[PDB]
Amino acid sequence: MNVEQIDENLAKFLAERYTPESVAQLADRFHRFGFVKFDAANRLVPDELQTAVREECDLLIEQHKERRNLLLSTTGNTPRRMSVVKSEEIEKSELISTLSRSEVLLGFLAGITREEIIPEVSSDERYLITHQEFKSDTHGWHWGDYSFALIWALRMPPIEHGGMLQAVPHTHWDKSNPRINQTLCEREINTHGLESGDLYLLRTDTTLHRTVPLSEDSTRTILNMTWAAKRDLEKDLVGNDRWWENPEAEAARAV
Amino acid sequence: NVEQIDENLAKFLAERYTPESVAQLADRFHRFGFVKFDAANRLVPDELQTAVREECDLLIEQHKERRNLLLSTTGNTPRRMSVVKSEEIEKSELISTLSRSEVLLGFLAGITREEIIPEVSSDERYLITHQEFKSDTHGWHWGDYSFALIWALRMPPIEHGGMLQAVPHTHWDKSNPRINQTLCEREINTHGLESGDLYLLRTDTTLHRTVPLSEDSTRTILNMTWAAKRDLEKDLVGNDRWWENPEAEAARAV
Amino acid sequence: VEQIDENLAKFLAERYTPESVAQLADRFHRFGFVKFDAANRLVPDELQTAVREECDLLIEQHKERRNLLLSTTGNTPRRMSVVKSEEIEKSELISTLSRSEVLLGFLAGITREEIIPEVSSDERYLITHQEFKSDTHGWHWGDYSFALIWALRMPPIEHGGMLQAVPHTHWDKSNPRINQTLCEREINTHGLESGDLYLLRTDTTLHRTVPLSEDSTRTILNMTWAAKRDLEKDLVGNDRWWENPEAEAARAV
Amino acid sequence: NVEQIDENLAKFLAERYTPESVAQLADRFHRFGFVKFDAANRLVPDELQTAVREECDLLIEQHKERRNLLLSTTGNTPRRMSVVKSEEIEKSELISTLSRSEVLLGFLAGITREEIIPEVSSDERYLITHQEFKSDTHGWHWGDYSFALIWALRMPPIEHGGMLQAVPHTHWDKSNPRINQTLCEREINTHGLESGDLYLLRTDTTLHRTVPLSEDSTRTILNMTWAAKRDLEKDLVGNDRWWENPEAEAARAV
Numbered sequence A: 001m002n003v004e005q006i007d008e009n010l011a012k013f014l015a016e017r018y019t020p021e022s023v024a025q026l027a028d029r030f031h032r033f034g035f036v037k038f039d040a041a042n043r044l045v046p047d048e049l050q051t052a053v054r055e056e057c058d059l060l061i062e063q064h065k066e067r068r069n070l071l072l073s074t075t076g077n078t079p080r081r082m083s084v085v086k087s088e089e090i091e092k093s094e095l096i097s098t099l100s101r102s103e104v105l106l107g108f109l110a111g112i113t114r115e116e117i118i119p120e121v122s123s124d125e126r127y128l129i130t131h132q133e134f135k136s137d138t139h140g141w142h143w144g145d146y147s148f149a150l151i152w153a154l155r156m157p158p159i160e161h162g163g164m165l166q167a168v169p170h171t172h173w174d175k176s177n178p179r180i181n182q183t184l185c186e187r188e189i190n191t192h193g194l195e196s197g198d199l200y201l202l203r204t205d206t207t208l209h210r211t212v213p214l215s216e217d218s219t220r221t222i223l224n225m226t227w228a229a230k231r232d233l234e235k236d237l238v239g240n241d242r243w244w245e246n247p248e249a250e251a252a253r254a255v
Numbered sequence B, D: 001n002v003e004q005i006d007e008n009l010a011k012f013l014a015e016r017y018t019p020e021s022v023a024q025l026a027d028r029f030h031r032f033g034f035v036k037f038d039a040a041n042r043l044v045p046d047e048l049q050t051a052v053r054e055e056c057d058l059l060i061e062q063h064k065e066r067r068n069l070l071l072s073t074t075g076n077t078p079r080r081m082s083v084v085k086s087e088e089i090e091k092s093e094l095i096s097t098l099s100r101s102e103v104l105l106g107f108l109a110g111i112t113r114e115e116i117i118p119e120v121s122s123d124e125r126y127l128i129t130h131q132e133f134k135s136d137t138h139g140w141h142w143g144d145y146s147f148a149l150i151w152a153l154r155m156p157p158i159e160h161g162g163m164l165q166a167v168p169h170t171h172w173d174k175s176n177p178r179i180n181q182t183l184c185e186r187e188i189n190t191h192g193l194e195s196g197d198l199y200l201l202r203t204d205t206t207l208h209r210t211v212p213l214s215e216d217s218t219r220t221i222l223n224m225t226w227a228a229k230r231d232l233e234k235d236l237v238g239n240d241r242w243w244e245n246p247e248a249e250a251a252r253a254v
Numbered sequence C: 001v002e003q004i005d006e007n008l009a010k011f012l013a014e015r016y017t018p019e020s021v022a023q024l025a026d027r028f029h030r031f032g033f034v035k036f037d038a039a040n041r042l043v044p045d046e047l048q049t050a051v052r053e054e055c056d057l058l059i060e061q062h063k064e065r066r067n068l069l070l071s072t073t074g075n076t077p078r079r080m081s082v083v084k085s086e087e088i089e090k091s092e093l094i095s096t097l098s099r100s101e102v103l104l105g106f107l108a109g110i111t112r113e114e115i116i117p118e119v120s121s122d123e124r125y126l127i128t129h130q131e132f133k134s135d136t137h138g139w140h141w142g143d144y145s146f147a148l149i150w151a152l153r154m155p156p157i158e159h160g161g162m163l164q165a166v167p168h169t170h171w172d173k174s175n176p177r178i179n180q181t182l183c184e185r186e187i188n189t190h191g192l193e194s195g196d197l198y199l200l201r202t203d204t205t206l207h208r209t210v211p212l213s214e215d216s217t218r219t220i221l222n223m224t225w226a227a228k229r230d231l232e233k234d235l236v237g238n239d240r241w242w243e244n245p246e247a248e249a250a251r252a253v
């Protein structure tokens, strides 16, 4: 119930599973792949907490889903074909908004990032829900404006139907000249399959990533909590490409 | 569809199991009455499981029936849940054929160490139970037949109940079940389940129940029941078939 | 040097939480036994190597063969070589480490009671070195509460040498009832690999090592500690065979 | 005791491998040049392993020979070890018959995906290497033949060295081996081994070495070498058969 109670409980949940040594091994993996998964073997939150977060997200989707179907010029015209729930609607959730600022959760994850995780991001990008449900729905190749995202894989299709996360770490976002396909020609793609209930941390500014299009009608739902690193602060947003908040963004080209 | 399911299931099993590793599962099945197929030791492709669950979700929506009763043949333990009857489930081509698959039954017989025979009373070949209210439960009981494959289609968080509790190496005397005396004499093993798990159960000699939901949640299973040779030619007794008939003779008001 | 405590403290702090030590305390009470293996280390590699080397010298210099039966434990055998506690105590490394406030302070989170390095001078330490077929540390209990056992060298499991234990027992020296206790209680068998350590509740855990099925090498170091319940206890038994092979309870064979 | 081995081995492998799981080991062998048979993937029964190890330990005590040289056909990389020659090992009836077992060779051909032919130069059929001293090593090299089954009979702890380092998808040019250049162009995969492991190695296209021992310790292997079709009627060139002839022209002193 009380926000101090979830923090107090989460602190114990993590202390039952992690040591400074094992977190340092997760930090190595995060640096190597841009990505670290918390699955059935290595949980991040109590199952009752994730259940509460999923049910709140199910409600926001029912009440506020907005279909997007566009190409984004700042990422080489890669597609966005999904429904979204905007950040300002998600922020009305006391659970999601407080958990996304938990000193316990941010303090734990900073041992994986090896730097301070700062909950000071543009108010249109604190949270995002994506809800894919039709064949060929996809979150096309892109980067993030900020350093970090904790992605909740709330509902995942069987791997045979797509929806895996593909990633190329150790890259960067040149919005004037993204060179996405030339980068794929130069770099190996790592494909990360996900199961419902998984969570994963993603270094979104230096990891080029997409979700594999759904091969048939199927449900893929995630919650993205975005955070900044120090390098993101006092840096100006550019690109006029904030399509999830504004489907009429200058860089969005509708289909 | 078609015979492609069996051919693909065979490959899926051959990628994961060997005679040596199946014999190790057989030892566990015999020690615990129970073996679990979880995220690390899967039993069916996720695509196949998904199709089964969608079939069951539809059957629940069209045919679910509430049950709220005590069964006198099991010490008046409760049954509080919704069910879908075997004869409705049987209309599913997917579930009925998979339940008779020579690939699936032949694999699982390496665990039972005896032939799994798909010839059971037509009111008990399949069952779906669907719990969703606080205190919903499948109270302590045994099964009339030797085997069940349980699909843990949807499980609540462990903190909300819904685990399977089991005491292997028991027997069901319907005139004197001795459930609470048996618990005083034997240790209880509690098995937590997660959505997507499956598990094989020795239902005739394992006393078992589902831990009641501690709050409104959702717990949904599909039960595929099979016979062993010892179950054939034997007559059903007890007038206690509460899932097919809510007013079976043994069923009592709460 | 004298920096072991600083090194050990940092080593343990990186691998344990109070919550994870509480899980070990549960296991210790339930089994009388808790094993520090590759997944749950207790000392750095450098310290293990140093302790093992010191013990390897002590064996080369002071090994003493024992082959007897002990009447206070039902005439169960002792077939092994030993190095007496007084020889081992001359090691500044082993004696210092066996009194480290970091080691004893951490392990007290497992025992859940103070660990007291106030033990009879002939039982503070023991090395046992089994080398021949049928060598065994037969069924027995300890006079004190606690032992930290260093599995310095262990044979492959197929050659024997595992620890067998039955927790929640006690040592009646006039009527040990070992075989009758085995008939009433389940035996837990614990295999060990070289470099393992384990903590043992020696006064309430009946235990033995499974005899060697063939000539092999099994070498351990025993640091024995007291609990409060042990202090000012009168040692009874005339059975301290490892310090004195002519103890009265020792029947040779 | 000679046709019994073939029969006992076939049943041992039938219980632990399916065609599908062998196909997965073939992918790894192709990709890495290397497949490990460890506790999770046994290749021979423990009794047979023990018999071979005891035989090799006798051959070592009786016939071990020190080698301490640089090999000019592999860029002067070192060979610092003891060896037992193929001629002495060949007198073992157990090792000899096992190395030609149609069961063993037939099983492993599911991993190589081609026939494994026990038709190699008599001086290379078998080899024991026995490393005992700090900086003992089998320096960077290739094999003249396609295949080797290595028995990791005794391995030091990983912290003391003795791992197998490998670069697959290479070739051995004995006039210009370009070892260090190849290391600059390619990633090195390091394979730790434990006593009791076996591993299959594609010796002609995998550049490999053993990491030098960082202190006195014991590392003992048995190499069974086989040919593939590409190797039949092979011209052996280089004057570099240092294990069999320490006065080989290509063998230099340190």
Ligand SMILES: N[C@@H](CCCC[NH3+])C(=O)O
Pocket (backbone or CB within 6 Å): A072, A075, A080, A125, A127, A128, A142, A143, A144, A145, A224, A226, A244
């Ligand atoms: N920059 C991302 C949007 C991230 C929204 C959530 N932080 C894209 O181009 O799709």
Ligand SMILES: N[C@@H](CCCC[NH3+])C(=O)O
Pocket (backbone or CB within 6 Å): B071, B074, B079, B124, B126, B127, B141, B142, B143, B144, B148, B223, B225, B243
């Ligand atoms: N005998 C069980 C019912 C099993 C029905 C499905 N095989 C009970 O009393 O609850």
Ligand SMILES: N[C@@H](CCCC[NH3+])C(=O)O
Pocket (backbone or CB within 6 Å): C070, C073, C078, C123, C125, C126, C140, C141, C142, C143, C222, C224, C242
């Ligand atoms: N009481 C043990 C000897 C323990 C000596 C070392 N603490 C026995 O009878 O074998």
Ligand SMILES: N[C@@H](CCCC[NH3+])C(=O)O
Pocket (backbone or CB within 6 Å): D071, D074, D079, D124, D126, D127, D141, D142, D143, D144, D148, D223, D225, D243
């Ligand atoms: N070609 C190897 C010798 C392998 C001998 C055993 N087949 C080397 O240069 O060391």
Ligand SMILES: [Cl-]
Pocket (backbone or CB within 6 Å): A142, A143, A144, A145, A149, A204
């Ligand atoms: Cl992003």
Ligand SMILES: [Cl-]
Pocket (backbone or CB within 6 Å): B141, B142, B143, B144, B148, B203
């Ligand atoms: Cl049942």
Ligand SMILES: [Cl-]
Pocket (backbone or CB within 6 Å): C140, C141, C142, C143, C147, C202
């Ligand atoms: Cl003792």
Ligand SMILES: [Cl-]
Pocket (backbone or CB within 6 Å): D141, D142, D143, D144, D148, D203
């Ligand atoms: Cl070679």
Ligand SMILES: [V+3]
Pocket (backbone or CB within 6 Å): A142, A143, A144, A204, A209
């Ligand atoms: V992204």
Ligand SMILES: [V+3]
Pocket (backbone or CB within 6 Å): C140, C141, C142, C202, C207
């Ligand atoms: V003892």
Ligand SMILES: [V+3]
Pocket (backbone or CB within 6 Å): D141, D142, D143, D203, D208
């Ligand atoms: V080689």
